[PDB]
C-alpha cells in the first residue's frame, strides 16, 4: 500500500490541520493553503476531503492557460440547476479544490479572468450566466485553493481583492520528530516483507530523516537553482526500497544497508553537479551509516561501487562490475547490429548511468529528465535502455516549420498507440523539440496529470471514447460510465507512457524554464551527467588508442607532480599521450572563458579519433619508407659485395 498516493499517516499536525480546515469550511469561508512545494497541501487536502461525510471533491488543477469555462464545466458534472445552483447530493456540500491558483497569468492589463470569477462567486454568492443573462445563485457550494509562494518564478502574485475573502493557512514542513514517526511507519510496512529485520525499522527511518535534513542544509538553492529538497524525496526513497525489496532475493543486513545507500545515492545525489559535492554526499552517507547503523562488513559507498541491477538475473540484486560490463558490451553489440550503429566506448560512468536510467524506466509513471553536456551519451543511452526493457521509442521530428498542430498530432498518435494498442512507449523529448511556451504547457499538462484534456474535444472526444469503449469490451471488462472509461484510460496512460527529457544547455533561459517548471520538477527524475571527469576521459582514451601501434620508440619516464597526472602512473607512451590530451582539453576549456558551463567532450572524442587515424596513416607511411630504404640498402650492400669479391 506504499504506492497509493492517498495513503496518509495520521500525525498530530495532519489532525490539527484537518480540524482547522473543517472549522474554516463550516464558517462559510474560503481557504488558501500556501507553503513550500513539499509541505503536503494536496495530500492533507485530499485526505481531509476524502474521509468527509459532509463535503465532496471537485479536483481541478489550474495552469497558465485557464479560463472560467474549465471551472464551469467542472461544476456541471457535480451541480444541478434548479435560479439556484445546487449540488447533486442532498446532504453533502461541495468543495472546489483549485490546486496552484498562482499559475493563472495576468493579461496585458494586469488581471486574470479566473481569480475574478472566483472572487465573484466567493463574495457576491453567484455569477452571471453569459448566453441568456441570468444570475445563478449559489447557496452551499464551497471553494478552497492551494498555491506555492509567489517568490519563486512561475507563480504570479495575486490580487488582494480575491485573497481578502479567504483565510490563508501556511503549511510548513513537518518537524524532525514527525518525519521520523511517519517514515518509521513506512519502513515498518516495508520490512513486513523481511520478518527477520523488524527491529531495524526505527534506525533506518532516523537515518533517512537525518540524510534529508543534512542534504537540505548543505546543498542549498544558492549553489544551484534545482537543489530543492522536500519530504517527497523521502517518500520516493521508501517507494524505491519497497520496489527493490519486493522483487529481490533474500536480504541480509549488509545487503539492506547497501540497498538503502544505493537508493539514497540515486535519489538525493542524482542532481549534484560538482565532484566536491558528490564527495561530500559520500562522506555524509558514511557518517549517517556510522551513526545510525553501526554495522561492520560494509564496502565502499561510492556510486561506482553500488551497482544494483535486475538485468543479469530474475531478481533485483547487487551484480558484479565485470559481469555487468561484459553483459552491457554484448547487449550493445547486439543493439548496434539490430538498430542504429554508433561507436560507443563502455566505461564505468556509462554503466552507472545505464543502471539508473533502467531503474527509473521500470517504475510505473517513470519519467526522466537528463541534464548534462552535449555528446555525453544521453539520447543513444536512453534508446539502448529502452531497447533492453522493450519500450517502443518514439522521437518527435520537430523542425522550425512546425506549430502546435504537428506536436499535438504526434502526442495524439503516441497516446493512441499507448492505450488502443497496449504498447509501452518511451517518448524521448529534447529541448530543441520545444520552441514556444505552448509546447512546455502541453508537456506540463501531460506530466502533472495523466492526460491532456484539451487535446480531445467534440467529435475527436466522441470517437476516442467510442474506441475506448470498444477496447474495454474487447478485453471483457464491464465498464459503461464515462468516468470509469476515463480513469481507466488515464491509468493506462500513466502505466505505459514514459517521457524522457534531454537538456543540453541548462544555462539557457528556455532550459531554465524547462527545469524550473513545477510539473516537470516534481514528477521527473533528474540525472545530472554534466561534463566528463578525468577518470572517464582516461578510460575512453585508453580504450580508444589501444587499437593502434604507438610503442615503437624509447620513452623516458619523467618525474612529475602527483595531481598533474590523471591516468594510472606512466609506464608506456600511451599513458603520456592520454595525459597530454586530457591536460590540453582542460587548458583549452579553461582559457576560452567558458565559465561554469558544461563542457561537451565532443572535442576530446574527435581529437582521439583524428589522432588514431593520423597515427595509423603516418606509421604506415614511415614503415613503407623504412622497408623501401632497407631493401635498397640490402641491394646496394649485395652489389658492393659482388664488386669487391670479383
Amino acid at each position: 500500500e506504499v504506492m497509493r498516493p492517498d495513503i496518509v499517516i495520521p500525525t498530530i499536525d495532519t489532525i490539527k490541520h484537518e480540524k482547522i480546515f473543517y472549522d474554516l469550511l463550516n464558517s462559510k469561508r474560503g481557504i488558501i493553503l500556501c507553503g513550500p512545494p513539499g509541505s503536503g497541501k494536496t495530500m492533507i487536502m485530499n485526505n481531509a476531503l476524502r474521509n468527509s461525510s459532509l463535503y465532496d471533491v471537485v479536483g481541478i488543477n489550474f495552469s497558465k492557460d485557464t479560463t472560467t469555462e474549465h471551472i464551469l464545466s467542472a461544476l456541471h458534472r457535480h451541480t444541478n440547476y434548479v435560479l439556484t445552483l445546487l449540488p447533486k447530493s442532498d446532504i453533502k456540500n461541495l468543495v472546489l479544490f483549485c490546486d496552484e491558483i498562482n499559475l493563472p497569468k495576468l493579461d496585458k492589463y494586469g488581471s486574470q479572468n479566473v481569480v475574478l470569477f472566483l472572487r465573484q462567486l466567493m463574495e457576491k454568492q453567484g455569477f452571471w450566466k453569459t448566453p441568456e443573462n441570468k444570475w445563478v445563485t449559489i447557496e452551499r457550494i464551497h471553494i478552497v485553493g492551494a498555491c506555492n509562494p509567489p517568490t519563486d518564478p512561475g507563480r504570479i502574485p495575486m490580487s488582494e481583492r480575491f485573497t481578502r475573502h479567504a483565510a490563508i493557512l501556511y503549511l510548513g514542513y513537518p518537524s524532525g520528530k514527525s518525519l521520523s514517526q511517519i517514515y518509521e511507519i513506512y519502513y515498518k510496512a516495508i520490512f513486513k516483507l523481511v520478518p527477520e529485520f523488524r527491529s531495524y525499522t526505527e534506525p533506518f527511518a532516523r537515518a533517512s530523516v537525518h540524510l534529508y535534513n543534512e542534504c537540505k542544509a548543505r546543498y542549498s538553492t544558492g549553489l544551484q537553482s534545482h537543489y530543492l529538497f522536500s519530504p517527497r524525496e523521502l517518500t520516493r526513497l521508501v517507494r524505491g526500497v519497497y520496489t527493490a525489496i519486493n522483487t529481490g532475493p533474500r536480504q541480509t543486513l549488509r545487503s539492506l544497508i547497501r540497498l538503502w545507500a544505493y537508493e539514497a545515492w540515486r535519489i538525493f545525489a542524482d542532481r549534484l553537479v560538482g565532484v566536491k559535492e558528490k564527495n561530500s554526499f559520500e562522506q555524509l552517507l558514511y557518517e549517517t551509516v556510522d551513526k545510525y547503523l553501526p554495522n561492520q562488513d560494509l564496502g565502499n559507498i561510492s556510486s561506482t561501487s553500488l551497482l544494483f541491477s535486475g538485468l543479469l538475473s530474475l531478481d533485483f540484486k547487487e551484480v558484479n562490475k565485470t559481469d555487468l560490463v561484459n553483459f552491457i558490451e554484448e547487449r550493445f553489440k547486439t543493439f548496434c547490429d539490430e538498430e542504429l550503429e554508433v561507436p560507443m566506448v563502455i566505461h564505468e560512468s556509462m554503466v552507472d548511468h545505464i543502471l539508473r536510467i533502467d531503474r527509473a524506466l521500470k517504475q510505473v509513471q517513470g519519467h526522466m529528465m537528463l541534464i548534462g553536456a552535449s555528446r555525453t551519451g544521453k539520447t543513444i543511452l536512453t534508446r539502448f535502455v529502452a531497447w533492453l526493457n522493450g519500450l517502443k521509442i518514439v522521437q518527435p521530428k520537430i523542425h522550425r516549420h512546425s506549430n502546435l498542430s504537428d506536436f499535438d498530432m504526434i502526442l495524439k498518435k503516441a497516446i493512441s498507440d499507448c492505450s488502443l494498442k497496449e504498447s509501452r512507449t518511451c517518448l524521448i523529448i529534447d529541448e530543441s523539440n520545444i520552441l514556444e511556451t505552448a509546447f512546455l504547457e502541453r508537456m506540463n499538462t501531460l506530466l502533472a496529470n495523466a492526460d491532456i484534456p484539451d487535446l480531445f474535444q467534440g467529435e475527436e472526444y466522441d470517437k476516442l471514447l467510442n474506441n475506448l469503449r470498444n477496447k474495454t469490451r474487447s478485453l471483457g471488462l464491464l465498464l459503461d460510465t464515462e468516468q470509469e472509461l476515463y480513469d481507466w484510460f488515464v491509468g493506462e496512460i500513466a502505466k505505459n507512457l514514459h517521457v524522457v527529457f534531454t537538456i543540453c544547455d541548462p544555462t539557457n533561459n528556455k532550459s531554465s524554464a524547462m527545469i524550473s517548471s513545477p510539473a516537470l520538477f516534481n514528477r521527473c527524475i533528474i540525472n545530472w551527467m554534466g561534463d566528463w571527469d578525468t577518470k572517464t576521459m582516461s578510460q575512453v582514451a585508453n580504450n580508444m588508442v589501444d587499437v593502434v601501434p604507438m610503442e615503437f620508440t624509447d620513452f623516458i619516464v619523467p618525474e612529475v607532480n602527483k595531481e598533474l597526472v590523471f591516468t594510472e602512473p606512466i609506464q608506456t607512451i600511451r599513458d603520456a599521450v592520454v595525459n597530454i590530451l586530457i591536460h590540453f582539453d582542460r587548458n583549452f576549456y579553461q582559457k576560452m572563458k567558458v565559465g561554469v558551463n558544461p563542457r561537451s567532450p565532443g572535442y576530446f572524442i574527435d581529437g582521439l579519433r583524428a589522432l588514431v587515424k593520423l597515427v595509423t596513416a603516418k606509421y604506415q607511411d614511415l614503415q613503407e619508407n623504412q622497408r623501401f630504404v632497407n631493401v635498397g640498402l640490402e641491394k646496394l650492400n649485395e652489389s658492393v659485395l659482388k664488386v669487391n669479391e670479383l
Binding site: 552535449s374 516549420h401 599521450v577 589522432l611 593520423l614 603516418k618 614511415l622 631493401v631 652489389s639
Partner: protein, 302 residues
C-alpha cells in the same frame, strides 16, 4: 624523423579539431601551450613544426589557390581543416560568402547549393544524397532538424548498402556524397546539437589578421624579390625531391634487374640537394629579421 611522429600527430589532430574557431593569436597561444605540455610529459615533437607543411602537400595548396582561396596562411589552415574533416561535417563561417566559389571550383559541376529557407529543400537533398553530389547548404544560422541523422551520421547498414532516415522514409546514400554547411552571420545562434557535431571553422578577418595582412602586403610590395626568391627555392626544392625520388626508383629498378649513368645522375642530384639546402639555410633568418622589422607597422595599423 621517426622519434618525432607521435608528438606531431598529436599536434596535428588537436589543430584539426580544437582550433577551427580561433583567431591567430589564440591559435598561437594554444599551440605554444600544447608544445609546453608535450615537453613536460617527455614526448618529442618537431622543433620547426608548421601545420601546413606537415599535413598538406604543395599540390593541394596550388589546387586551393587556383580555385580561389586567399593567400593568407590562416585561410590555408582553415581550408586544410575543412578538406581533412572526412567524418564531421564541416561548418564554414564566411562574412563575405566567398568559400562557396572555392568549394565549387574544387568539386567542379558536382556541387549543388541549397538553403535552409526553401520549400523543395528536403526533396532535392534526398535526390542529391541518393545520387552522391556534394551539397552546400547556406544560411546555417537557421539549421533545420530534418538532417539530424546526417549531422550525427546515424546510419543503418542495410546489408550491402547504407541507409539514412530523413523525414518519414529511408533514403540511400553514396560513398562520394559530401555535406557542407555555410553560414554568413557570425552573431547567429547555432544550435548546440549541430555545433557540438560539426567541424566549425572561421574564415573571418580579425585585428591579429590585420597585423598579419599588413606584414604580408608590406612584404609583397616593399621587397617582392625576397618573396619570389623564397617561392622559387621552395618550388625548386620540391621538384628536386620528386626528381631524386624518381632517380632512386630508377636505380632500384636497375639494381633489381646504365648503372654507372644512373649512379652519376643520383650523385649529381644529391650534391644539388646539398647545395640547395645549404643555400636555403642562410636565407630563412632574413625573413625573421624582416618580421622583427615590420612589427611597428602592424602595431600602428591595429
Amino acid at each position: 624523423t621517426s622519434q618525432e611522429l607521435i608528438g606531431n600527430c598529436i599536434i596535428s589532430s588537436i589543430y584539426e579539431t580544437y582550433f577551427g574557431h580561433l583567431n591567430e593569436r589564440e591559435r598561437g597561444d594554444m599551440l605554444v601551450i600544447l608544445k609546453r605540455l608535450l615537453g613536460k610529459f617527455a614526448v618529442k615533437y618537431d622543433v620547426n613544426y608548421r601545420f601546413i607543411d606537415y599535413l598538406v602537400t604543395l599540390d593541394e595548396k596550388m589546387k586551393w589557390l587556383e580555385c580561389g582561396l586567399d593567400k593568407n596562411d590562416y585561410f590555408l589552415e582553415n581550408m586544410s581543416i575543412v578538406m581533412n574533416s572526412q567524418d564531421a561535417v564541416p561548418f564554414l563561417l564566411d562574412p563575405s560568402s566567398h568559400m562557396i566559389t572555392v568549394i565549387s571550383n574544387y568539386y567542379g559541376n558536382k556541387t549543388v547549393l541549397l538553403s535552409f529557407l526553401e520549400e523543395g529543400f528536403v526533396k532535392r537533398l534526398e535526390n542529391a544524397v541518393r545520387f552522391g553530389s556534394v551539397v552546400i547548404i547556406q544560411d546555417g544560422e537557421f539549421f533545420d532538424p530534418i538532417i539530424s541523422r546526417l549531422i550525427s551520421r546515424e546510419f543503418n547498414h542495410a546489408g550491402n548498402r547504407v541507409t539514412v532516415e530523413i523525414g518519414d522514409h529511408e533514403v540511400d546514400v553514396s560513398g562520394d556524397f559530401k555535406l557542407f554547411i555555410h553560414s554568413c552571420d557570425p552573431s547567429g545562434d547555432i544550435p548546440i546539437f549541430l555545433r557540438s557535431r560539426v567541424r566549425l571553422v572561421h574564415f573571418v578577418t580579425n585585428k591579429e589578421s590585420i597585423e598579419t595582412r599588413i606584414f604580408d602586403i608590406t612584404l609583397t610590395e616593399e621587397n617582392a624579390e625576397m618573396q619570389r626568391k623564397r617561392e622559387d627555392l621552395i618550388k625548386l626544392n620540391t621538384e628536386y625531391r620528386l626528381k631524386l625520388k624518381n632517380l632512386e626508383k630508377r636505380l632500384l629498378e636497375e639494381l633489381n634487374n646504365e648503372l654507372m649513368v644512373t649512379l652519376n645522375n643520383l650523385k649529381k642530384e644529391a650534391m644539388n640537394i646539398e647545395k640547395k639546402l645549404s643555400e636555403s639555410e642562410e636565407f630563412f633568418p632574413q625573413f625573421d629579421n624582416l618580421v622583427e622589422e615590420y612589427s611597428i607597422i602592424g602595431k600602428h595599423s591595429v
